């Protein structure tokens, strides 16, 4: 089959690791959620094409500006994540992550992914965010940011409930295939 590489970037605790784990096991693990993700090689069939998709995390590499880029060589698609419960994680997409990814990897497709969409309808989170005078990211603020950064597309998912996860990685595969 044909072999493609995917890397997930974005701020620490935007759910990068959780998302990779939920997809790779295909279960929100009931007993223990690993702290770390090593790598994984998914067998995906999308639109009648079979692909081996290698998955890589950048978790832990956020403060280490010469180590982090060693993750990037030969990437075919970037998932650029933010957390819907964290408007600041979205402010940093065009500031920090986009310039980096475009410097190292200028013509790689980027999919912008809003994680933890379940938290949009959560009492605790609405209240906590209201205290710094904010609310959960709205779907149109997401689409607007994706448009602004020249992403290939915008998608939402929730690793906790698995809603949207399969679709993200199927679309990433399609994007890697262009």
């Amino acid at each position: 089959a044909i072999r493609k590489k995917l890397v997930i970037v974005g701020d620490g605790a935007c759910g990068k690791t959780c998302l990779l784990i939920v997809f790779s096991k295909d279960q929100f693990p009931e007993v223990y959620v690993p702290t770390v993700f090593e790598n994984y090689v998914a067998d995906i069939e999308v639109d009648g094409k079979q692909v081996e998709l290698a998955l890589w995390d950048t978790a832990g590499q956020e403060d280490y500006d010469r180590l982090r880029p060693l993750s990037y060589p030969d990437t075919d698609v970037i998932l650029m994540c933010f957390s819907i419960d964290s408007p600041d994680s979205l402010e940093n997409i065009p500031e920090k992550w986009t310039p980096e990814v475009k410097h190292f990897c200028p013509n790689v497709p980027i999919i912008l992914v809003g994680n933890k969409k379940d938290l949009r309808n959560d009492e605790h989170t609405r209240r906590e965010l209201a205290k710094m005078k904010q609310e959960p990211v709205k779907p149109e603020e997401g689409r607007d940011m994706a448009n602004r950064i020249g992403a290939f597309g915008y998608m939402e998912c929730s690793a906790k409930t698995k809603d949207g996860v399969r679709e993200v990685f199927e679309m990433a595969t399609r994007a890697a295939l262009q």
């Binding site: 223990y32 702290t35 090593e38 180590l67 993750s71």
Partner: protein, 236 residues
């Protein structure tokens, strides 16, 4: 890897590796600690496996089946012997600490109360310097190693055959040459995550909290130095 250790770390968590008659006698907070400690050791076992795949399958097979100049092979796998020694030793201390802690009559029920000291040891003194220098060296040679792999793959049909041969088993699905190189480079950035989540469930005994806190500082300082010491080498 050796069947005994793989068996001891086959389960998805500490909570599933031990007998449940044993699990039930412990507080939730202990279980959450042990789960993360188990994950630290499990991923260290996997990391040593990766390095052994690199030294014994890839490097030695290139030397003994192809007959590439040792200089080319050293470009593909820089510093692997030294990394192998660092991590195999650290692993043997982790596994020794687990074995000391087994219940008599059991090969699986244990609780590790003291990890801090062993982490302080690994990440300070001579052993911490050897890690800083070896990772500065390896991470600086990382990019060159990938380019050299692709050059050899594209040009030499026997090289391709060798690779397709040694990476044919299912158990090497994730462990091609390039994968291996990145798995290693990413290892060091895993240690703070693991150590912080351990520390978060280690408040019960104040000395352990302080030991883990010191270990975390030491790791971040090592990561910091390795990061300052890196400059990609090039070739062609």
């Amino acid at each position: 890897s050796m069947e005994m250790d793989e068996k001891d770390f086959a389960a998805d968590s500490w909570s599933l590796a031990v007998d449940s008659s044993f699990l039930q006698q412990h507080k939730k907070e202990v279980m959450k600690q042990q789960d993360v400690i188990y994950e630290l050791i499990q991923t260290e076992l996997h990391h040593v496996r990766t390095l052994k795949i690199m030294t014994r399958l890839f490097r030695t097979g290139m030397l003994e089946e192809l007959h590439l100049e040792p200089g080319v092979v050293q470009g593909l796998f820089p510093c692997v012997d030294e990394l192998s020694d660092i991590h195999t030793r650290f692993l043997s201390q982790l596994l020794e600490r687990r074995r000391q802690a087994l219940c008599p009559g059991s090969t699986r029920n244990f609780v590790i109360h003291r990890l801090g000291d062993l982490l302080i040891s690994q990440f300070s003194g001579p052993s911490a310097e050897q890690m800083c220098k070896t990772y500065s060296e390896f991470c600086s040679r990382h990019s060159k190693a990938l380019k050299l792999y692709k050059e050899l793959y594209a040009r030499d049909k026997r090289f391709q055959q060798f690779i397709r041969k040694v990476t044919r088993p299912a158990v090497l699905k994730r462990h091609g040459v390039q994968e291996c190189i990145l798995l290693v480079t990413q290892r060091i950035t895993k240690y703070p995550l693991l150590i912080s989540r351990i520390l978060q469930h280690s408040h019960g005994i104040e000395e352990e909290r302080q030991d883990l806190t010191t270990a975390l500082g030491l790791v971040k300082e090592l990561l910091s130095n390795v990061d300052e010491g890196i400059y990609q080498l090039e070739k062609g």
